[PDB]
Amino acid sequence: HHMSPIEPAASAIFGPRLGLARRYAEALAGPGVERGLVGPREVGRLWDRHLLNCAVIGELLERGDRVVDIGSGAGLPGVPLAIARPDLQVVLLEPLLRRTEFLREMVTDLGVAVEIVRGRAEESWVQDQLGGSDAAVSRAVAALDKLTKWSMPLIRPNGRMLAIKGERAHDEVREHRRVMIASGAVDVRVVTCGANYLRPPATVVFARRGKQIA
Numbered sequence: 001h002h003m004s005p006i007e008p009a010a011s012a013i014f015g016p017r018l019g020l021a022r023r024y025a026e027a028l029a030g031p032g033v034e035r036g037l038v039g040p041r042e043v044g045r046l047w048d049r050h051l052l053n054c055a056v057i058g059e060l061l062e063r064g065d066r067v068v069d070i071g072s073g074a075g076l077p078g079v080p081l082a083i084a085r086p087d088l089q090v091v092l093l094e095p096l097l098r099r100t101e102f103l104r105e106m107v108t109d110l111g112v113a114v115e116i117v118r119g120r121a122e123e124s125w126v127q128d129q130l131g132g133s134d135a136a137v138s139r140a141v142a143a144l145d146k147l148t149k150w151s152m153p154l155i156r157p158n159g160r161m162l163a164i165k166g167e168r169a170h171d172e173v174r175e176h177r178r179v180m181i182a183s184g185a186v187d188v189r190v191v192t193c194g195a196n197y198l199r200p201p202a203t204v205v206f207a208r209r210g211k212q213i214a
Ligand SMILES: Nc1ncnc2c1ncn2[C@@H]1O[C@H](C[C@@H](N)CC[C@H](N)C(=O)O)[C@@H](O)[C@H]1O
Pocket: 070, 071, 072, 073, 074, 075, 076, 077, 093, 094, 095, 096, 099, 119, 120, 121, 122, 138, 139, 140, 141, 150
């Protein structure tokens, strides 16, 4: 079978919306695979590697944050985040129409307060449409320099960038810190989330939108 939630982590993270989480995992395991959006090998990793690892980065988001998920793909990390944290207002930014079709289907079949923008982060109209967001999250999108260039315009002054990055976080920070600062980041550091539940924990390149103009 192997679609039943990993406990107690799943209830820790999703609480009363565990059922929404399970519905989402099922659709990723079903139509997500049938449509070529979820790799077959990932089906048995949907809880620990995808839903849980993505949703724990909510530990770094304040109540009621407006969040842009840059390059959401099949909904990761934005949809696990929205399910875990109903207080958030999540927007999934994704350019591929095949993927946005998928996302709209799921978001309506879940009742989750998630919106979908089909566009690329570097587009002027996107920067206007999603400017002033409280946070910009991402996973598996781009190297940290381009990612930060894409993220900072969408974040209000003193907002937060959360780039899920894994064991390559530190290297990436060390390589790109300088140009990250030039793009408007300050206080760049590697942080971990969900360390009560996951080993390794989720590893996130955290930054603030500093006051400097890029
Ligand atoms: N400039 C861009 N702006 C927004 N999304 C992009 C951009 N470039 C690539 N993408 C998307 O980023 C996603 C890359 C995927 N590898 C990641 C999907 C998802 N974030 C995941 O972790 O499973 C794709 O779905 C792309 O269509």
